[PDB]
Design an enzyme around this catalytic site. Structure first.
Site, PDB file in Angstrom:
ATOM      1  N   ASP A 255       0.838  -1.197   0.000  1.00 23.14           N
ATOM      2  CA  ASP A 255       0.000   0.000   0.000  1.00 23.14           C
ATOM      3  C   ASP A 255       0.877   1.252   0.000  1.00 23.14           C
ATOM      4  O   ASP A 255       1.012   1.959   0.989  1.00 23.14           O
ATOM      5  CB  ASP A 255      -0.948  -0.027   1.194  1.00 23.14           C
ATOM      6  N   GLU A 256       1.476   1.516  -1.155  1.00 26.63           N
ATOM      7  CA  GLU A 256       2.244   2.728  -1.384  1.00 26.63           C
ATOM      8  C   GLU A 256       1.885   3.307  -2.745  1.00 26.63           C
ATOM      9  O   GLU A 256       1.466   2.587  -3.658  1.00 26.63           O
ATOM     10  CB  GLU A 256       3.759   2.470  -1.326  1.00 26.63           C
TER      11      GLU A 256
END
Ligand SMILES: [Mg+2]
Ligand SMILES: [Mg+2]
Ligand SMILES: [Mg+2]
Lengths: 267, 267
Positions: free
Chosen positions: B128-129
């Site tokens: 989750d970037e």
């Protein structure tokens, strides 16, 4: 007129321009959002014929330095110090495996010569990618880095020397009754996105437990890490990879906490 | 002639390197694989402003690897190596933590399971970037999106692997509405390469990699130290990232010696 901690920005000149560092100022008139710009990165190379390390600039780094008047002096004119980072380059020579004081000193002269010729403010050490042992080189030893930094500081008593706190060099700061920690101006955490106090005998005002990568590290994390920097009394805040995009919100995420002000872009 | 030791994992940046290198390293004692899990890095979550609906997006190289799974993936699986598809933000506002509803989260999960089945993958990995929450008029991370997505995903593939790169908004939002999805994951690892950080996740140690190393950048001694600490302390996974096409025998054997008691060998 700005007051808070010293902001630092590594720039990957292979992909982006140094000048973006200078395009961010504080809305409240405090001054520059960034205090130090670092050119990433020069290299330490190994010449197998002469069995000797030498300082090497890739095409991009050489272009920035050759164009110092348009690519460096404008930042310095704004009051932004400019450093050159030095990195391993897979050829076996590194900052921690110089075989002797004289050999480490020869390299320090090349660094200080480069700082002088191109008008730089100092140097930053990043001891990665050396691949100690390639081309029949030795593994790290206890004296190389202490020798190297001791010579560099004697060469440039007025310039900045900083440490990207990683690799064998980072754990070999003391030798022969000399700890070179006080010969550095700054040391900072190398693990972007995290808080990690460097265990180095430097005062807190010259240390960056926080490290962030602008454009990747969550703004939530950028802000919290800059808040912790101030809360715990530390004096440096490390950032990496500012590009040419519009990073006003990314930068403001830490200027809000370090200086109590939001950032604005120059264009 | 089986291998005993923690499960090793290899993130491969397919924009530059081939999955097949992962299968090129076996143990000198017993001939088992050095690597147990390869992760294609990386597919993307895109937003699509028209439909206002997130969708799974493959870049040119990821699409090529998946389209050519018969020669890029199946050889690894036939060698006993599981292959996962990482999913990453892509600067368009949609991310794993800001689905507006259970239904929309369930819709993205069906796209992942479908792709797992179509290309014969062994599961999915979440990173989750880069989502840039807020772009294209999207919401900020909420407390429910990721729980919905993981519940729907595990419902779609009860038999497949779901792993967590332990970073970003989603990794702190694992419980909502009475449902903690921690046990719906098979693995969870430290995202901070070069370091040791135990994920604070309600998973058993056998399914955690506190260690994270970048092959070719993390010092071999650090690779070995973290691999030794994994066995000591009793963790079951060891995360590696960015195996390339060069000869990394000395880097791989740096951890296989400590994980499995045997040097590695290439080809
Ligand atoms: Mg001083
Ligand atoms: Mg000391
Ligand atoms: Mg972790």
């Amino acid at each position: 007129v700005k007051q808070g901690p010293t902001s630092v920005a590594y720039v990957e000149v292979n992909n982006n321009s140094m000048l973006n560092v200078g395009k961010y100022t504080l809305a409240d008139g405090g001054g520059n959002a960034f205090d130090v710009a670092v050119i990433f990165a020069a290299n330490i190379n190994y010449d197998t014929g002469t069995k000797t390390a030498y300082l090497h600039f890739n095409e991009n780094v050489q272009r920035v330095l050759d164009n110092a008047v348009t690519q460096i002096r404008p930042l310095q004119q704004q009051g932004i110090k400019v450093l050159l980072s030095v990195l391993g380059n897979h050829q076996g020579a590194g900052f921690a495996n110089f075989p002797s004081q004289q050999a480490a000193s020869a390299f320090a002269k090349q660094l200080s010569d480069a700082v002088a010729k191109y008008g730089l403010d100092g140097v930053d050490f990043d001891d990665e990618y050396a691949e100690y042992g390639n081309n029949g080189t030795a593994q790290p030893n206890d004296s190389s880095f202490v020798h190297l930094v001791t010579a560099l500081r004697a060469n440039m008593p007025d310039k900045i020397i900083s440490l990207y706190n990683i690799g064998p060099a980072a754990s070999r700061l003391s030798y022969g009754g000399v700890d070179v920690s006080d010969k550095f101006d700054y040391a900072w955490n190398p693990y972007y996105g995290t808080w990690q106090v460097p265990g180095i005998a430097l005062p807190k005002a010259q240390l960056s437990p926080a490290a962030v990568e602008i454009g990747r590290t969550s703004r939530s994390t950028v802000a919290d890490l800059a808040r912790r920097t101030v809360d715990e009394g530390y004096g440096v805040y490390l950032t990496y990879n500012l590009d040419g995009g519009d990073r006003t919100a990314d930068v403001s995420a830490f200027t809000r906490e370090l200086y109590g002000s939001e950032a604005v872009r120059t264009p």
